[PDB]
């Protein structure tokens, strides 16, 4: 066509030509002769108000891989008709290819596995852009150290070296650790790292007391790395500790660091070595029992927990585990009786009603579970040191949130209040943050939710990605509602 002469025909005749030129373009597109584009341009010169011509041009650029031209032409289609289905999906498809996942998800949302694919791509892009010196929550630290005999651990620092200038700092580190307080863990973490650095220097005139104190510093600085999820850092120090002076703790800790869902043969051989070094050490049996428990080997778990109990009968944790095993074995009555007998011995410890409340919740006795968590919270408030920390708040808030919308606005507000308090009392709890974030999102407090989801991701690899995913999904909802 000479478009010169066509443009000077009538409006019926000029449009008629558009339908005719468009159709010629379509013939070529079907014949994989995309350079189609020329005929559509011709059509545009006669009818620039037709979004089909721009949308068709963009289908050609999809076919030849010009992703930037796809965006330009689908955009032109969409500026005429913002709800054009093919333009929206083509533009989302090209944006995904260019790595503009939020733009893709936006158009896919307006259009309505594709959404989910781009969400994942966005979460990994953001996780990779973003990404430890950060401890787990004080609640989780108190639980981890609950089995150990503080006095024994603090007194295991040797005061008799002629060269050791770090032992007093090491002693303060352990003192702080076993105070089981928010300040205690932060100070322990600081001073263990400092003691280890001093020990590396000292090791380089050395004597055996200094070697054993170094092994002790290395052993705890190692488990702190494990707790921070720096597994290689942990293994390096634990191995150094073993190379200096083998101890049951260093074997327990190295086993935890190298634990393997596939083969648990190595885990159990470390524990045999720990047993050999000291067959009269309660935490060895307790931790091995924990692993048999996790592997659902209840007979062997019971044996080990009974051994831990028989070596340190003043520690509440072996009793609790034994009661939990009864419940898992299919014996609630006997479990409840064991918890009650344990509550008689340890009437001030919140560990007993907190673990029992978890069993009640599993049974669906939510009202009794909440009463147990109420008691646990009061017992916890009265103690100087952390026992169960924010566990009861999270426990009760989770029940109340699920009961509220299964809206009971009083239970839902109560849950918010509980999780808000939990977040303030234990700022490094990702559990508390994510819990609160989901409720904020239900209330359409999107900005608040996003901040909580993002903090949780800082705090939490698959966990970091899950939190990042919640945050990125919420940012898209925010963008949609903004327009």
């Amino acid at each position: 066509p000479d478009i010169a002469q066509l443009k000077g025909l009538s409006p019926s005749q000029r449009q008629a030509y558009a339908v005719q030129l468009k159709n010629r373009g379509n013939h070529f597109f079907t014949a994989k002769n995309f350079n189609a584009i020329k005929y559509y341009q011709y059509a545009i010169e006669l009818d620039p108000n037709e979004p089909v011509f721009y949308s068709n041009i963009s289908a050609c650029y999809i076919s030849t891989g010009d992703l930037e031209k796809v965006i330009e032409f689908t955009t032109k289609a969409l500026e005429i008709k913002p709800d054009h289905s093919k333009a929206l999906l083509r533009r989302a498809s090209a944006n995904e290819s260019l790595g503009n996942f939020t733009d893709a998800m936006f158009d896919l949302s307006v259009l309505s596995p594709m959404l989910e694919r781009n969400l994942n791509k966005q979460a990994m892009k953001v996780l990779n852009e973003n990404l430890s010196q950060v401890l787990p929550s004080n609640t989780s630290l108190a639980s981890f150290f609950g089995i150990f005999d503080s006095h024994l651990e603090v007194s295991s620092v040797n005061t008799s070296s002629n060269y050791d200038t770090a032992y007093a700092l090491l002693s303060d580190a352990l003192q702080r650790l076993y105070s089981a307080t928010d300040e205690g863990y932060l100070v322990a973490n600081d001073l263990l790292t400092k003691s280890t650095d001093m020990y590396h220097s000292l090791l380089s005139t050395v004597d055996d007391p200094l070697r054993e104190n170094a092994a002790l510093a290395l052993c705890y600085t190692g488990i702190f790395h494990f707790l921070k999820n720096n597994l290689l850092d942990a293994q390096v120090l634990l191995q150094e500790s073993i190379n200096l002076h083998p101890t049951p703790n260093s074997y327990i800790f190295l086993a935890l660091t190298l634990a393997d869902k596939e083969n648990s043969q190595e885990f159990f051989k470390f524990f045999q070595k720990a047993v050999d070094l000291n067959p009269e050490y309660p935490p060895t049996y307790y931790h091995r029992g924990q692993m048999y428990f996790i592997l659902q080997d209840y007979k062997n778990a019971k044996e080990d927990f009974q051994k831990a109990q028989s070596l340190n009968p003043e520690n509440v944790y072996p009793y609790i585990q034994l009661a939990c095993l009864l419940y898992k074995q299919g014996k609630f009555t006997e479990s409840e009786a064991f918890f009650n007998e344990t509550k008689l011995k340890f009437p001030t410890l919140p560990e007993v009603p907190t673990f029992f409340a978890e069993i009640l919740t599993d049974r669906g006795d939510f009202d009794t579970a909440i009463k147990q968590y109420d008691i646990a919270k009061r017992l916890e408030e009265v103690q100087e040191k952390i026992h169960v920390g924010i566990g009861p708040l999270i426990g009760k808030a989770t029940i109340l949130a699920r009961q509220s919308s299964q809206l009971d606005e009083e239970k839902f507000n109560a849950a918010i209040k509980l999780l808000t308090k939990a977040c303030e009392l234990d700022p490094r709890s990702e559990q508390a943050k994510i819990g609160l974030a989901q409720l904020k999102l239900q209330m359409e407090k999107i900005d608040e939710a996003i901040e909580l989801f993002e903090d949780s991701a800082i705090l939490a690899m698959d966990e970091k990605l899950q939190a990042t995913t919640f945050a990125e999904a919420a940012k898209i909802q925010k963008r949609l509602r903004a327009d």
Partner: peptide, 5 residues
Amino acid sequence: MEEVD
């Protein structure tokens, strides 16, 4: 969705 109109 891959077809011209």
